[PDB]
Amino acid sequence: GVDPFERNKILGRGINIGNALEAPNEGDWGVVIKDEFFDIIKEAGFSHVRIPIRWSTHAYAFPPYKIMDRFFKRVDEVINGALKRGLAVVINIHHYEELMNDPEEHKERFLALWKQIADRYKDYPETLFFEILNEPHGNLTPEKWNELLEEALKVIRSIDKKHTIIIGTAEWGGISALEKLSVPKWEKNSIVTIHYYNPFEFTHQGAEWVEGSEKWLGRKWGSPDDQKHLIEEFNFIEEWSKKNKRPIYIGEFGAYRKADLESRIKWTSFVVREMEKRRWSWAYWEFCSGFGVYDTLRKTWNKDLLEALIG
């Protein structure tokens, strides 16, 4: 009889170790998760780490869709590395693109991946959280996601009743389809996650993977209007949280390094203040890459950005 709001409180402040295991091969996008990263993160004050994992590229495409031994092993090493420092850990299925493009064709493989993950970690500590699917979008519409997520809940709950499950929104995981999200009433131990990157043109200016983002380079953030618009979107998330009685986790939020530094600090610091006012848990995107707050080579945090997060 777990209290999902207490689990959310336990999750608390976190950071994403991105551009690592969610790439095709860990290291491909710049980050290889070193076990030493966990000492660095816990010592700076964080409560948890979120670990994006592209399981779909490390499991057979044919039944029984088995996850490859070596990769499962690597994920184990990362999860335990985090747990050894007393960090809570969030794992998910990240970048399963074929599922987004043809959900019915991939549904059973997707559900088979969760049966295997749950099976593997059902006895791990209460501080391990299962995030169903990162940023549903495309043909996996909001309407479809409500049914798919319930099917995922069922496979997981038939194996594990101890761990809190984290459920995102469709249309890329932001607030645009929050209004359409429904979590089944029978499920009692889940947190709803939203990725907050608004204004998108500010946070993703110049991101090489976003078509036409170059046009937003130079954009700043910090006006009272900028702040009021953010407050109104958080008030929208919050009233939805109260009407649906589900805890809130802002699983990603961050501004790309190409954005001018002062704006990045102001935006990050304001978002943190406003999420804390609402008692939400959250995870900064991300630890040491294109949106990084820690330089792993020089072994140094951007102190002001870290201040924004933990201060």
Side-chain angles (χ1 to χ4, degrees):
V2 180
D3 181 343
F5 287 87
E6 282 300 321
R7 286 285 177 80
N8 202 38
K9 172 187 296 186
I10 287 163
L11 188 53
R13 305 189 192 226
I15 187 149
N16 281 275
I17 300 181
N19 281 354
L21 300 171
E22 81 275 27
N25 302 281
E26 178 183 15
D28 282 354
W29 295 350
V31 185
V32 171
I33 308 188
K34 271 121 277 186
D35 188 72
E36 169 198 52
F37 284 1
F38 299 124
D39 297 312
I40 291 150
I41 288 155
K42 182 80 201 188
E43 254 229 358
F46 291 97
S47 169
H48 80 274
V49 286
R50 172 164 182 273
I51 306 163
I53 297 165
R54 191 191 294 218
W55 300 97
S56 57
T57 197
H58 300 286
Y60 289 115
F62 52 81
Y65 313 122
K66 187 184 87 83
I67 292 170
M68 307 176 173
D69 300 336
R70 185 165 194 164
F71 190 74
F72 232 145
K73 174 171 175 162
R74 172 61 182 150
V75 167
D76 286 359
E77 301 166 22
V78 171
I79 290 160
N80 288 112
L83 293 174
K84 288 183 187 63
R85 280 62 174 195
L87 289 169
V89 179
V90 177
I91 59 175
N92 71 5
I93 295 187
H94 208 108
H95 290 147
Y96 189 166
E97 201 65 1
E98 301 77 1
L99 179 61
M100 308 308 187
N101 295 326
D102 193 332
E104 276 288 289
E105 185 43 36
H106 284 265
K107 173 177 164 173
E108 277 312 299
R109 177 153 180 269
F110 166 66
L111 298 173
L113 297 178
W114 265 117
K115 161 184 59 208
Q116 294 169 75
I117 299 164
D119 243 315
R120 184 121 180 162
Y121 306 122
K122 65 181 176 301
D123 294 306
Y124 269 50
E126 246 92 87
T127 52
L128 174 60
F129 294 72
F130 295 150
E131 173 174 0
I132 308 186
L133 177 68
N134 187 70
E135 299 184 355
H137 66 263
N139 289 323
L140 175 47
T141 55
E143 295 74 357
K144 182 51 160 179
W145 172 232
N146 287 331
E147 292 312 313
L148 187 61
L149 67 85
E150 181 168 19
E151 295 268 84
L153 254 4
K154 289 168 173 174
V155 289
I156 296 174
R157 288 301 182 220
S158 66
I159 288 157
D160 186 330
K161 282 176 169 83
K162 168 192 189 183
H163 301 102
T164 296
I165 302 183
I166 293 174
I167 303 165
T169 59
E171 284 178 357
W172 295 98
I175 63 174
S176 70
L178 176 69
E179 46 187 72
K180 299 183 186 202
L181 182 67
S182 53
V183 180
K185 196 195 244 261
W186 64 260
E187 171 58 35
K188 309 292 196 201
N189 179 24
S190 286
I191 301 169
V192 169
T193 185
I194 295 153
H195 293 179
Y196 197 76
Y197 286 117
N198 294 342
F200 187 86
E201 289 178 14
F202 166 65
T203 63
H204 287 253
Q205 49 186 282
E208 293 78 9
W209 66 92
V210 186
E211 307 182 303
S213 66
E214 342 275 348
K215 59 203 191 64
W216 321 324
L217 267 27
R219 204 211 179 164
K220 298 197 168 178
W221 189 94
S223 76
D225 283 324
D226 283 350
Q227 293 165 58
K228 182 174 296 179
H229 166 86
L230 200 151
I231 286 165
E232 289 170 349
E233 294 190 334
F234 279 20
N235 283 335
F236 173 84
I237 291 168
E238 177 64 11
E239 55 172 299
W240 184 89
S241 173
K242 35 174 51 162
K243 162 186 183 84
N244 295 268
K245 289 284 150 277
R246 301 295 183 176
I248 298 292
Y249 172 47
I250 304 305
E252 295 179 18
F253 71 101
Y256 198 48
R257 57 169 257 274
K258 291 190 197 178
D260 81 273
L261 192 52
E262 311 292 330
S263 285
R264 291 183 68 222
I265 292 150
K266 198 173 190 181
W267 186 89
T268 301
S269 186
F270 189 68
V271 174
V272 168
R273 157 84 338 265
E274 292 302 322
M275 303 180 295
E276 287 302 322
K277 273 149 86 166
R278 289 158 181 92
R279 299 173 71 74
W280 299 341
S281 53
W282 48 257
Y284 177 77
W285 180 269
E286 27 85 23
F287 176 61
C288 59
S289 194
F291 292 72
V293 48
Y294 181 83
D295 182 323
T296 62
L297 310 152
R298 303 182 31 216
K299 288 193 197 279
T300 65
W301 293 93
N302 166 307
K303 323 168 198 74
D304 293 327
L305 243 190
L306 173 68
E307 182 94 66
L309 298 170
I310 302 302

